[PDB]
Structure formats: structure tokens, C-alpha cells
Subunit: 158 residues, 12 copies
């Protein structure tokens, strides 16, 4: 029944609730990333196929980071196939084996919903815990950037 020295047992628990969501969000994300890492096919196959691994090994990186943070706060992280399917507010990636274009486009949107939920979770944190914030921010930086990669693959002449 402990907690970080400097946080009201209430603010603390509200942050937890926030991350627990982020965590399930990442677990879906990184599992989905690997999903496309497998079912992508096209002329510029390798390019993308390989481009995903890092973003994956990275998102999973944000999982241990967030969870290990939750436990630190006092609450107990949940990362079983169950907990995830519950906390999420979407339908798992609908694409099977398809073209590069297909996935990237679909992925574009997945990140939209991930960057958005994050941003909100950040702004909401500036009043709760600043630490758990610099943390979430950092992720945004790479999440948003990676998205760019996805997107740069779909543009026209400008």
C-alpha cells in the first residue's frame, strides 16, 4: 500500500489508470506491427518489411517502460491477451496478406489513434505527475516520427 513520496494516493491512482490504457495500446500496436511485418507483399517489399522491426523492438520497449512505471506507482500492470482486448477501443487490424500500400495506409490510421490518445494523456498529465509526462512525451517523438515514415510512402508530387 505504498506510493511515490510526493503524490497523493489519488493522483497516483489516476495516473496509473492512464498508463494502464497506454500499455494495452502499445501491446496492440507492437503486436499489430509485427502482424504487417509478416503479411506485407509488393514490389518494394523488403524496404517496408525491414523498416518495421525497429519501431516494433521500440514499442515493446515502451511497454516494459510504462508497465514497470505503473508498478512503481503502486497499482498492478495488466498485460495478458485478456487485459488488452478489454482496455482497447477499436477492432484489431483488419488486413490479411495485402500490398505495401494497403498496410501502410491502414497503419497510418492506427498511429493516428495512438498519437491522439497519447497527446491527450500528456496534456492531462501536466497537472498529475511531471515525470510520467516527460516519459509519455519522449514516446510521442518517435511514434509521430515513425508515422511520418509510413506516410512518406503514400504521398504524391507535394
Amino acid at each position: 500500500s505504498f506510493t511515490i513520496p510526493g503524490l497523493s494516493d489519488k493522483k497516483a491512482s489516476d495516473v496509473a489508470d492512464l498508463l494502464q490504457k497506454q500499455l494495452s495500446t502499445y501491446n496492440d500496436l507492437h503486436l499489430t506491427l509485427k502482424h504487417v511485418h509478416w503479411n506485407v507483399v509488393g514490389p518494394n517489399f523488403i524496404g517496408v518489411h525491414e523498416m518495421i522491426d525497429p519501431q516494433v523492438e521500440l514499442v515493446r520497449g515502451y511497454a516494459d517502460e510504462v508497465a514497470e512505471r505503473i508498478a512503481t506507482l503502486g497499482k498492478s500492470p495488466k498485460g495478458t491477451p485478456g487485459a488488452i482486448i478489454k482496455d482497447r477501443t477499436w477492432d484489431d487490424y483488419s488486413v490479411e496478406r495485402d500490398t505495401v500500400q494497403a498496410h501502410l495506409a491502414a497503419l497510418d490510421l492506427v498511429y493516428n489513434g495512438v498519437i491522439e490518445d497519447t497527446r491527450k494523456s500528456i496534456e492531462k498529465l501536466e497537472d498529475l505527475d511531471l515525470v510520467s509526462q516527460d516519459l509519455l512525451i519522449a514516446h510521442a517523438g518517435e511514434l509521430e516520427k515513425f508515422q511520418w515514415f509510413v506516410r512518406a510512402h503514400l504521398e504524391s508530387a507535394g
Copy 2:
């Protein structure tokens, strides 16, 4: 509509169906592993906590391996939070934050069901595809071994 040169489009598809199951099995496993990696607590905490990461980075290693194998065969791997919750025949890890003992014991059983399902999938493969077999075997070796680690933490004087 291709396939490995030397496999009947039927034997090939039957192997696929087999791995697709294994894959979902691993995804649960490795996600669950990380789950305990987070909610374990006790006197000999670190010991276990750290002991899990490798088995994890390893099981996820068997995921890319199996899936990338399925696609090679012709069928299309499915590794979304959805596909997994469906192909599985159990209830995701029921333990929240608990003692070392607790998890390890619980994990003991999880591996039972994983090693068993595997063994059977191996024997069943000796008639289908020998390659997709040496593959599944290798895993058993480490899966089984790791279990031992878990178990060695629960024994008595002999």
C-alpha cells in the same frame, strides 16, 4: 497461389494450420511472460524478474520464426490481439501482483500446456514436413529447459 517445391498443396496447408496455432500459443506465452515479469514480488525478486526477459526475447524470437515460415508456405499468418484470443484454448494468466512462488507455480502449468501441444505438433509433423519439424523441435529444447528453471525454484530436498 504458390508453395514450397516438394509439398502437396494439401500437406502444406495442413502444416500451416498447425503453426498458426503454435504462433498464437507463443504470442500468449511471451505476452504472459512479460506479464509476470512485471507483477512478481518477493524476497528473491530480482532473481526471477531478470530470469524472464531472455525467455521472452526468445519466445518472441520463435514468433517471427514460425510466422515467417507460414507465409513461406503460402497461407497468411494472423497475429493480431484478435487472432490469438481465438486460436487459444485456455484462459489468460489469472495472477495479478503476487509472490514469486505464486507465478512460477502458475507458469509451470502454462508451459505444460505449451510443451505438450508442441510435442504433439512435432510427432504429427514427421509425416508432413521435416523442415517445419527440426524447427519446432529446437524450440522444445529451450522451452522445456526454461520450464526446468521455473521448476527448480519450487522443489524440496529431492
Copy 3:
């Protein structure tokens, strides 16, 4: 008689005074960490013994970081056995050779006083220098986390 281009010679000096405290705090901490790294004994000895080195090589890491920051500001860091025993507001670790439990519990508290003093120093910095803040924050993240490690070694069934 210089200073960072953008800081009033007063705000600058007030930040210095703040870090100079943090610095002595770390020096005690990391010297103390190594202290227990030596006098710990018990059944799960190695676990802890080894678990400490990183947190140590890390806190000493925050020493060079903070001090090199102070000098940058204009004031002069003080890190002799003297300066530390003075800036501190506690009694150096009272434990000699004792059980794992003993130290970890005692250490739990030491970190309380370190995370607390830090948190306050952060909030107090948002008006002074934002840079010297992202800096202090970052540390909190790992300081707080490590504490968790210590703590996870002391819990019950929930």
C-alpha cells in the same frame, strides 16, 4: 563572472544553490549504495548485491552531470567529503553488516528522502530554468524506479 545567455545572474545563482544540494545528496547516496553493496548478507545475497552496482554507476553518473551543470552556470561545485557532510540533513546509513531485508528496508527510506527533496527541487525549477529541470526529472524516473526494485523485495501477498 559569466552565465548562461538568458538567465538573470540571480535566478542562475538560485538554481546553483539548488543543485549543489542535489549533488551532495547523490554523493551520499551513491557512497551509501556501495556501502550496502558490501555489507549485505542473506540467502538471496547475490541477487541484491549485484542489483545495486548499476544504480550506483548511475547515481555517480548523475553526479558528474549535476556538478558539470553547476560550473556551467557560473558557481563552483563542491564535492569533497567535507562539502557533502555539511549540505546534508540526515545521519549517514546506520546499518553495518546485516540481512538483505534490513538494508533494503533502510534503503527504502533513504530513497524517500531523496525522491522527495528532488520532486520539490523540480517544481521549484519550473520558474527558474527549464533545462536544469528536464535534467532533474529524468533522474527521478530512474531513482523512483530503482526504489521500486528495493520495495518489491519487501512486499506481502498484495
Copy 4:
């Protein structure tokens, strides 16, 4: 006039004859791989160009492996430009500088004939030498997989 303790001087010699074929097969393969590594051109050039080196450094890896195995058996490996052009049952890669598509498609077939000849050589080995089998199998795993890479570059919407 020696041989592995446990193999009839006849079974031994029959395995040799088998590998000696595999070896020349690899030598053609890896030399051919590098061939396209050079004459590929197109929009997604780099992707493929670079994708080939590893499969090459790998096939050449299977050369030393096989040959050093043959010598172990008692017979004498032959790997001169001559020996290869003789043991082979095909016409060296007919493509000069051409598109990505071109080579990959052409390569698809080359691997067909390599995976096929291998598979048969495996099944034929289960009665001769089990060791020289796990060996050939392993290769199949990567050979077959790489082919997939080639192929994934040629598919449609499903």
C-alpha cells in the same frame, strides 16, 4: 582410407556422392546470386541489391560446411569452376542487366530447382546418415525462407 566410426564404407561413399552434388549446386547458386546482385536495376533497386548479400554470404557458408563434411567422410570435395559446370544439370543464369522483377522471377525458379534437389537429398538421407541430414535440413529452412523473400516481391492482391 578412413571413415566415420559407424558408417559402412559404402553408405559413407553414397552420402559423399550426394553432397558433392549439393556443393556444386551451392557454388552455382551463390555465384549466380552475386551475379544478379550486380546486374539488377529498377526503381526499388537498393532494396533487392542489398537483400541478396546475406543470402550469398550464407550460401557460401553452406559450401564450406558441406565440403568440409565430405572430406570428413573420406572422399575428396571438388569445387573448381570445372567440377561445378559438370555436376550441374542446368544452364547458368541467362539474365544480363535487367529489371528487379526480371531477376527475382528468374531466381524464383532457380531456388525451385535447389530446394527440390535438396528435399529429395534429405529424404534419401534418413536411411544413410542422420547427421548429414540435420545439416541439409537446416539449409532448407533458410533457402526456402529466402525464396519467400524473392517471391513476396512478385505477388498480387492475394
Copy 5:
């Protein structure tokens, strides 16, 4: 015509304009750094000569960082010798081959103008995009620190 999910197409474009400036600032800086890396001469030559490379390989590091961030936002980074000479509000380093003292002193000032422009750009960002802020801050930390190095080479007895 896209943008980060959570930023008004206006706030987004205003941040871009801000970085685009920073970027040209860095390009001048790092090109200038290397400039002195070449024309420095004196008794304690090596010391400085070598001290610069890291700060260089680092500033160029902040270039890719900032620009790849701008593109992510939607606008298009400009980093040609042209774009830079335009966005800047100073006269390129006036020193040719000269003493250590000479450059360092001159460099002192260059950093003044870089840290200042940065600080302002940070404060101005707290209302626009927090992500693009933690980013700029981080740089300040090292920029400011390095300056210290330069400066520590010019002091008296206190």
C-alpha cells in the same frame, strides 16, 4: 496536406517556421565548428582540435533530428547552402587560421547567439507543441555545456 493528430494546421505551421530557423542555425554552427577544427593553432593545439569533433558530430546530430521533425509536421525542411545563408541573422565566422584563444573566444559568442535564440524558441513552444519542446531543451543542455568547455579555456584565477 497532413499533420500530427492533435495540432491545429496553424500551430503546426508556426512550429515549423521556428525549427526551420533552428536548423539553419545548426548547419551554420556545425559547419563553423569544423571550420575552427581546421584553422586552430597554438601550444595546446590538440586539446581543442579534438575537443570539437564530438560537439560537431553532435550538432549535425541535431540537424537530422530537427529537420526530420519538420517534415513530420507537414512543411518541407530546407538545408541547402542557400536556405541557410538566408535564414541566418549574422555574418559567418570571421576568423581564419589563428590561436586557440582567438577561436574559443569568438566561438564563445557564437554559442551565446545560439543558446539565446534557442531558449526563446523553447519558451515560445510551451504553448504550441510540448514534444517539439523536450526536443529543443535537450539540445540546450549539451549546447550550453559545451560552451562551458570553450569558456573554461578562457578564465582567470576565479
Copy 6:
């Protein structure tokens, strides 16, 4: 007022003048390379995007090399945004965010003017300084090669 033991103070100064040009040429090149590294977009994005970094970290490599050579000769290298915009005889890259094709084609030409100016500078050096030649040659090898990469991305069926 020194110089390499074996070079007439005149030949020496004429070589300097030659490199000083090369240097500014590289600085434009490498800055431009990074420019496209940022504004490229298309289906085979990653491929190219990543393909550029090495050639960049390499050209910047030829910068330190050439300049540090000039200083060795006696003259003083100039590598400020200024010096470059002056010594050059072209208009900085005209392409903003555009397709892969676009840039590569445009880049094709940029290298034309760089390999040409180089070649000439080599032939002209065989009478001046042989050392400063093997140096320039080496670069040609990689410069020319990289161009090939660019080009291989633009070809037809032969």
C-alpha cells in the same frame, strides 16, 4: 610560412587553391545530400532515404580529409556558409519535397558536376603533388560508385 619539404612554395599554393574548391564542392554536396535525405517521398521511400546517410557520413569524411590537407600545405581552409556559396559555380539544389525519382534524377546531375570537376582536378595534379592526388582519386572511386546507385534507380530494360 612553412610548407611540405619537397614542394615549391608556388606549386604548393596552386594545389591549395585546387582543394579549397573541392572542399566547398563537398560541403555543398553533403549538405545537399542530407537535404534530399529529408524531402524524399514515394513508394520506395525508405530504400533511398537510408541509402543516402552513408554517402553523407562519407562526403563529410572527405571534407575533414581535404581541409586538414590544405592546412598541412600552408594555406588556410575556408568552410563557413560564406566561403562555400562563393567558391561554387552552381545554384543550390532546386528541389523541395518531391518523389524519389525526382531527387535521384536531379542528384544524378549534381554528381556529374562533382565527378567532372574532380577528374579534371586529378589530371591537373599529376604534375603538382602526387600525394594530394591518390587522395582525390580514392574519392572518385566512391563518388562515382554512389552515383551508379542513384542511376540504377532510373534505368529501363537495358
Copy 7:
């Protein structure tokens, strides 16, 4: 009183008995290898002397591997100087300091008895446990290969 999920407590114990023998076999082998690593002398000394270390660091590698496997099965590995001298069916290496030729020839035979005992143990395992087989096979591959090395040092013109 546990065992791998899928093995009859009898088959399991029969495999154990098999490995326990292998293990003592390796321990003798690797201890013996080092023995010659020390007492070899001749014109081509270094060659051999150094050639042995890897095969050694490797056989000891098969020790931990086998034993850790036995424990996994349920029985208890025995690897004391005692257990070994008992399970073995030969007389420890009779050679003291002697020529290169001497040892290698003698070693030739030692490997005969090791590869033979292994082969049999493999064939005998195809009915018991397939895992504990791929394991023993793999070793054969390198054991047999190394022998070749030994042997290649003793041949004539063909």
C-alpha cells in the same frame, strides 16, 4: 518427482541413463583434450596446440548442455572426478609429453570411441525422445568434423 510433459517416467529415466554416460564421456574428452594441449611438442607445435582450445571450449560446452538436460528430465547429473572414472569404459590417455604425431594419432582413436558411442546413443534415441536427439546429433557434426582435423594431420599422398 516431475518430468517433461509427454514422456513416460520410464522412457524419461532411460534417456537420463544414456546422457549421464555421454556426459562422463565428454568430461574425460575435454579434460584429455587439454591434457594434450599441454604435452604436445614438435616442429608444427603451435598449429596443433592452438587448434585444440576451441574443440575444448566446445566439448565443455556440450557438458553444461547435456547435464542441464538431464536435470530437466528429472534425474540428477553426476560430474565429479568420481562419477566420471566410473561411467567410463576405457583407460585415460596414456601419452605424456610426446610429438604432435603421437597425440593426434592417439586422439584419433579416442574420438572413434566417442563418435561411435554417440551414434549408437542417437539411433537408440529416435524411439525415446526426439529432442534429446537433435541435441546429440548436432554434437556429432562437430565432433566428427574436429576428428577430421586431427586426421588430416596424419595422411599420405591420398
Copy 8:
């Protein structure tokens, strides 16, 4: 019939006799170490299990060291399962699979007999060969230290 230039053919042979003993002592030790590395079981299993490998890879390190030293002296090292069982004056480790406590305690004693025999061999060497002494000393340092590790696992409140 040679010897180190500076040692009486008698002193030399007496040192040899001394090391030859040490060597067999180590071989038992390191073989025994691995023995427990396998049969240890308990709650804090991993801790110890892993703690042993280094001390092992280390003692085996002192084997090559000592033996290669003996050969240097002129006599011929003996390191076969035989030689060891003879030179030793004890009964090989009596513990099978048992608790952590069990082994460590038992191991405690084993090291007693190893550090003791060593110490004496050192003092006895100060008159014979100083080199072969700094050598034996060094080992003591780590041997004794490791023992401490074992021991720290068995203590009470002081």
C-alpha cells in the same frame, strides 16, 4: 632436459611437484563447481546457479595457467581423469541434487581445503621461485573472495 635460466634443476623440479598438485586440485574444483551448477535447487535458485559459472570459467582459467607453467619448467603436466583422482587427498563432492543452502555450505568447506593447500604452497614457494608465487597468490585473491560469496549466503544477523 631444459629449465628456466636461473633455477637449479632441483628447485625447479620441486616447484613442478607443487603445481602438479595444485592443478589436480583445480580440476576437481572446477569440475565440482559445475557439478553443483547443475544439481542446485531452491527458492533463490537462479541467483546461485548463475553465480557459479564465472568462478568456473575462472578456475579452468587457472588450470591452463598452472599447467602451461609446469611444462615451461621442464616436467610434464598430468591432467587426465586419472592423474587427478590420484593426486587428490579427499572424496569427490558427496552432494547430489539438493538445496542451495546444502551445496554452498558443502562448497564452503571445499574451498577451505583449497585455500589452505594454496596458502601453504605459497609460503613454501618464497624460497623456490618468486614468479610461480605471484602466480599462486593472484589466484588466492579470487578464490578466497569467491568463498566469501558462498559464505555471505549462509550468515545470520552478524
Copy 9:
């Protein structure tokens, strides 16, 4: 229908023709090297066996180098088992499994014809392309050197 900016479409094609020969020469060489790497036997076996790999991993290094150079020029490299057996003007290595002496001597000659053909190709290049020269030269340095190694194995008292 392109070419290096600075080479007459004729000089360029004449250089190509020259390398294309060198390339086939290397392919034979490195394939032959590995050939002896396998069939060498004798007292000082290891010495040579291992001495070859580097020279091999090196000549294959000169293959990619030369070919990738040819393509750069405009012509299309040919490196199939076919192309090689044609461009060559000798009979592939006639030695099967034989002594160390045998091969080395035979190899001595092979290098004679490779160094000679090279030297000529160099002198012939000083008028064509200087770049494609420094390249060929470099190789000679190591080719010639390695030969020495071969040779040093065959000498008498002087």
C-alpha cells in the same frame, strides 16, 4: 546508355573489357583457393588450411569491388559459372586431395598468372582510367604479398 562524366564511351568500354577479365580471374582464384582449403593434408595442416580463408574472403572482396565497378562504367558484369569458364585462359586446378607442399607449389604458379595478368592490366590502364587503376594496384599489393606466404612455405636455407 550512360557513362562516367569524363570518359570517352570508347575508353570506358575498353576498361570494362579489361575488368570483366580480371573478375572471371578472381572468381576462379577464390573458388580454387577454397578448393585447396578443403583438400590439403599433411603434418602442418592447420597452419595452411586456416591461412587461406582470409585471402579467400579477400579475393571475393575484390570480386564485388571490380564488378560493381564495371556496372558503374556502363557495361554489364558477367559472373556465372559460365562466363568464368569462358573468359579464362587456363585449366582449373588439377590437384585433388594432396600434401601441403603439393598445393602451395601449384598455387604458387596460379598466383604467377594472376599477378602477371594484373600487372599488365595496370600498365595498360594508366592511359585509360586512373581510378580503375589505383583500384587494381591495391589488389596487387595483397595478391603479391599472399603469394609470398605461399612461397615462404617452400624455401630452403636461402
Copy 10:
């Protein structure tokens, strides 16, 4: 209530008392080293600044070494800010931010008092424990050496 097998519980305790002093001596030293690492300023700043880190990471290296040695003996190491300020017989470094010359000179003396106290502690040990001696000696070698570095910065023409 244990101790190294071969040391009288009295000699053992007398050695402890000796090291415990050394330890506090090092802790001051290394903390002081870092102190100057921060407050040094001058023309040849970097030179020294960087020259200190290694000696620091080294002295701290001698801390863990000594302490871990004390515990091995039986007594309990003390390394809190307290214990140190007590065991020492001097006044912590009196220099704040000053010139290079200043510190180095001051440091010269500090090492005098450290090398002296050490030397004496060595001679005094030759009768107590030889192991704890080779240990202290080794340090002297580097301590004394580093001093030289300090000193070489203060000399005249001879």
C-alpha cells in the same frame, strides 16, 4: 565469526583495520579527484579535465576491491560519508574553482600522503597477509604513475 583458512583471527583483524583506513583514503581521493575534474579552468583545460576521469574510475575501482576484501576477512567495511571523514587524517581539498596549475600542484601533495600511507601499509603487510599485499602493491603502481602525470605538468627545463 569466520575468517580466511590460514589467518589467525588476530592477524586477520589487524589487516582489516589497515584496509578500512585505505578505503576511506580512496573514497576521499576519488571524490576529490572528481572535485577538481569540475573546478579546473585554464588554457590547457581539456587536457587535464579528461586526464582525471580514468584515474577516478580507477580509484573507485580500488574501493570495491579493498572493501570486498575486508568483508572477505570477516570485519565489516564502512564507506558512508561519515566513516570516511573520521578515519582520515587531513582536511578535504581546499581549492575551489582555480587554474590547472593550482589543482595539479595541490593534487601532487594529496598523492604524496596517499602513496606514503600506502607504502607503509605494504611493508607492514609482508608479515600479516601476502595476498592483501600484492593487492595494495598493484595500486601503488598506478597511483604513483598517475602522480607522475600530475607532476610532469609542473616541471621546468629539467
Copy 11:
């Protein structure tokens, strides 16, 4: 009585004579370099002291290179303290322990005589052996460059 295939037994022997001189030149140089590496003293001591090692480990690098080249040619390299003192045409470094300035100035001249003798040996080689030329050139590049380092330590305001 052999020689590189393409060199007249006379041209070959004349090149040898040339290198044999270079070699003794380097041996003096690198031995001398280390000489100053030891006897340098001053305020900016470390800077230089450390600056020399690389140039040393590099010149010794040119020794093995040249000699191993001579042997390749047919003649026999001579690198004993004797051979060197003979082939040289100067008096070994006259400086004992002195200031930084002292040595560097003195060294300046030493390199003059080394770069000069080299340059001449290069020009003289363009008619003999081109290979043994690119080799000597390369060295010049770094020799000359390093000299610059030495020199940059002695200049004034321009």
C-alpha cells in the same frame, strides 16, 4: 631465387635496396617517437604525450608493411638494432627530458628528413614498381599530416 612475376631481377633488387633504407628510417622514427613520448614535460604535457602513441603504433605499422614487402620481392629485410644504425644518415635524437616545445621543434626536423627521403624514393619508384609506390605514397599522406600536428603546436598569429 624467386621474384614477383613482372619485375626484372634487377629492377626488383633496386626497389629492395630502396625500402631497406625506408625501413631503417621508420625503425629509428618510431623508436624515437616513443622516446619523446617519455621525456616530454610541460604545461600542456598530456596533450602531446597522448598525441604521439597513434603516430607510433602507425609507423611501426609501416615497418611490418615495408619489410614484409621486401621479403616478397626476394631480398631479405634487416631490422636489428645493428642494421638500422648503419643504413641511417643522421644522429639519433639528441633531446633528453625537455619541454613540449623543445621536442616538437626537434621532431619537426626529424620528419623533414623523413618526408624528404620518402618523396624522393617515390618519384624514383614510378619507373621501377608502381605497387611499391602507392604503398610509399599512402605513408607520406599520414607522415606529412602528423608533421602538421607537430607544427601547429609551434606557430604564431599566422
Copy 12:
């Protein structure tokens, strides 16, 4: 006019005189080692050729070690081709290009005179400086050992 705190200005100078000799001894040694590294020829060439480099890079290692020690003491190391030819009491290696046997035998003796001179210098040091002793001892260990290597190449059947 300084010296290690604890050494009489006389004892100190007598040690210096001792090392200064050792140093010249090493310089001859390591220069000579490389000498044979070049002129060795025979059937088992490579073996030895390569066996020497390490002992060389090692002896040169003992050079910097000893010299940097002398300077520490107060006197000034001398390591020019001159100083060496003077301090030595032998005739530089008399062997030109010869057989493996030749050199090794010759080298055998060289080491005799080096190990002997060393041993004596050690015994003589036990009364002067213990530090400068552990130092010299250490070397003996490897010097003596390496000799063994040389020697093991010359023995008979026992």
C-alpha cells in the same frame, strides 16, 4: 628533482639504472622479434610467423611500462637507437633469412640472456623497491612462457 615519497634519492636512482638496462634489453628484443617475424621460412612457416606478433606487441608493451616507470622515479629514460646499442652487452641477432628451426634455436638463447638478466634484476630489487619488482616479475612470467613456445618447437621424443 623529485622522487616517489618513500624512496631514498639513492635507492631510487639505483633502481632507475636497473630498469634503463631492462628497457634497452626489451627494445633490442622486440625489434629482434620482428626481425625474425620477417626472415623466417620453412614448411611450418605461418605457425611461427604469426606466433611472434603477440610476444612482440607484448614486449613493446613492457617498454612503455618500464620507461614510464623510470620517469616516474625521477631519472630520464633513454630509448633511441643509440642508447640501446650502448646499454646492451651482446651482438644483435646474426641470422638473416633462414629456416624456422634456425631462428627459434637462436631465439631460445636470446631469451636465456633476457630471462637471466631479469631474474637477477628481480632478486636485486627485493631490497630496493617492491613495486618495481612485482612489475619485473610479471614480465618474467610471460617472457619465460613464450620461451617455452619457442622451445617446444625444438624437442625430441622426451
